[PDB]
Design a protein around this ligand. Structure first.
Ligand SMILES: O=P(O)(O)O[C@H]1[C@H](OP(=O)(O)O)[C@@H](OP(=O)(O)O)[C@H](OP(=O)(O)O)[C@@H](OP(=O)(O)O)[C@H]1OP(=O)(O)O
Ligand SMILES: [Cl-]
Length: 135
C-alpha cells in the first residue's frame, strides 16, 4: 500500500480501539509485525484519498480479523518522535473471524485486554497509543 502524508510530512494513519462490547471494558490489541513479543493498537497507514474512518476499519480487518459497529472519533494523535498523525476511532466488535489476512500472511496474534492492562503493555514502546485511552 502507498504511504500518505500530511503537508507537514507526518505519515497519515488510522487506528481503532476495538472494544468487546458497548461497556468499553476490554479492548483488542494485536502483535507487532517486526517484534511479535510486543502489543500495539491495530491501525496503519491511510491510502491515497481514503477517508480516515474507512482506513481504520480496513486496518482492523486486516490486522485483527474483526468487524463491528464504528463509533466516535476519539481524537487525532501526533507522535512527534516518529512523525505520525493518527485518527483514532472506537469500534464495537460484533464479528470475530478465525482466519484473517495478517494471521494467515504473517502469523500476527490478537488478544483481549482490560483497559488498564492494555495501557500497561503499550507504555514502553507505544506511549502515544497508551494515551489513546486516557479519556
Ligand atoms: O517502514 P517504516 O517507514 O519504518 O514505518 C514502520 C512501519 O510502518 P508502516 O509500514 O505502516 O509505514 C511498521 O509497520 P510494519 O510495516 O512492520 O507492519 C511500524 O511498526 P508497528 O506498526 O508494528 O508498531 C513502524 O512503526 P512504529 O515505529 O511506531 O512501531 C513504522 O515505523 P515508523 O515509526 O518509522 O513509521
Ligand atoms: Cl467491553
Amino acid at each position: 500500500q502507498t504511504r500518505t502524508y500530511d503537508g507537514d510530512g507526518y505519515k497519515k494513519r488510522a487506528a481503532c480501539l476495538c472494544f468487546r462490547s458497548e461497556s468499553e471494558e476490554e479492548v483488542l490489541l494485536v502483535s507487532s509485525s517486526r517484534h511479535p513479543d510486543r502489543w500495539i493498537v491495530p491501525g496503519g497507514g491511510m491510502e491515497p484519498e481514503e477517508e480516515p474512518s474507512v482506513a481504520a476499519v480496513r486496518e482492523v480487518c486486516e490486522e485483527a480479523g474483526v468487524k463491528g459497529t464504528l463509533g466516535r472519533l476519539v481524537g487525532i494523535f501526533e507522535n512527534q518522535e516518529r512523525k505520525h498523525r493518527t485518527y483514532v476511532y472506537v469500534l464495537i466488535v460484533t464479528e470475530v473471524l478465525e482466519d484473517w489476512e495478517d494471521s494467515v500472511n504473517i502469523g500476527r496474534k490478537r488478544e483481549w485486554f482490560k483497559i488498564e492492562d492494555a495501557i500497561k503493555v503499550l507504555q514502553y514502546h507505544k506511549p502515544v497509543q497508551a494515551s489513546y485511552f486516557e479519556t
